[PDB]
Amino acid sequence: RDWSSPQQPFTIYGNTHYVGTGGISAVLLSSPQGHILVDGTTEKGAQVVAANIRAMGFKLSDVKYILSTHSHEDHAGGISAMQKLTGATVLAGAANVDTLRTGVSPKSDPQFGSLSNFPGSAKVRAVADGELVKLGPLAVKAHATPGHTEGGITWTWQSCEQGKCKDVVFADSLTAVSADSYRFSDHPEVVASLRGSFEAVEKLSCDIAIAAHPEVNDMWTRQQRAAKEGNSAYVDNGACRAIAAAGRKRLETRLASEK
Numbered sequence: 718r719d720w721s722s723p724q725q726p727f728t729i730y731g732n733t734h735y736v737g738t739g740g741i742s743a744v745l746l747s748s749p750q751g752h753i754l755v756d757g758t759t760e761k762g763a764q765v766v767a768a769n770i771r772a773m774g775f776k777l778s779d780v781k782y783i784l785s786t787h788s789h790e791d792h793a794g795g796i797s798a799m800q801k802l803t804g805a806t807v808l809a810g811a812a813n814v815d816t817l818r819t820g821v822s823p824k825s826d827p828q829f830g831s832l833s834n835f836p837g838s839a840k841v842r843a844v845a846d847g848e849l850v851k852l853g854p855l856a857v858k859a860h861a862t863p864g865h866t867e868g869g870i871t872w873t874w875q876s877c878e879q880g881k882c883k884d885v886v887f888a889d890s891l892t893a894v895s896a897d898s899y900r901f902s903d904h905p906e907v908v909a910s911l912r913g914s915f916e917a918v919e920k921l922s923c924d925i926a927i928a929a930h931p932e933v934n935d936m937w938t939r940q941q942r943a944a945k946e947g948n949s950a951y952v953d954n955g956a957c958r959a960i961a962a963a964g965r966k967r968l969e970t971r972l973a974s975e976k
């Protein structure tokens with residue numbers, strides 16, 4: 718399950734579909750009036766994501782917005798091509814917009830340098846904390862969840878099966894990780910942001926979480942169980958809470974390391 722690998726797309730719940738690679742989540746949120754894609758995966762992933770969207774019976778021209786969680790290569794590397802293939806506008810937290818436009822991280826990014834750059838992307842605009850993105854019957858809410866990056870966004874919406882509507886959360890990474898030459902200890906406002914974000918995430922309404930790294934909420938296990946139990950298997954409203962706590966533990970572990 719490498720970040721750029723192939724992966725048979727599947728429905729997670731209702732009009733929420735997985736269209737990413739084997740190691741990184743991307744989600745298509747489909748409607749008759751156009752689709753929203755969350756994240757583009759790697760630069761070569763763009764090949765894969767675009768195949769899937771079509772493998773599920775959808776056109777790329779119907780993709781109107783690409784939402785970014787955050788601007789590291791493994792989630793955002795493919796965004797540029799998908800923009801080109803779809804013609805979509807790319808949406809991102811203000812602080813990551815330049816990194817998507819240019820391909821190159823700011824010095825303030827903990828993985829400046831350690832993550833080599835990626836292809837800069839056309840048609841990028843910022844979203845604000847709380848902003849509601851509408852596309853026909855679709856409504857996706859941005860939540861600022863900075864820390865791992867300054868412009869990190871967690872995205873939420875609702876999908877319905879047989880009249881049962883669930884709150885779906887595409888959770889940004891909340892992990893304190895960086896280049897070797899970077900210390901969270903010397904960046905206490907970065908630390909406060911991470912802490913703010915744990916809180917925000919563990920408070921979201923969260924029936925179904927899809928983590929940017931899909932194993933962070935057991936995607937492939939859930940998918941296995943879903944062959945049996947249907948898409949119930951993806952539903953677990955403790956999931957965002959779980960994610961936040963692993964992030965918060967990971968910040969303890971990391972600040973320790975540093976001393």
Ligand SMILES: C[C@H](CS)C(=O)N1CCC[C@H]1C(=O)O
Nearest residue numbers: 789791890891892894930933
């Ligand atoms: C470094 C990445 C974010 S870009 C991350 O959070 N990963 C990478 C693999 C698992 C997961 C984690 O540490 O929880």
Ligand code: NA
Nearest residue numbers: 786809810870
């Ligand atoms: Na973002």
Ligand code: NA
Nearest residue numbers: 732855875876
């Ligand atoms: Na929806």
Ligand SMILES: [Zn+2]
Nearest residue numbers: 787789865890
């Ligand atoms: Zn990252």
Ligand SMILES: [Zn+2]
Nearest residue numbers: 789791792890
């Ligand atoms: Zn990542």
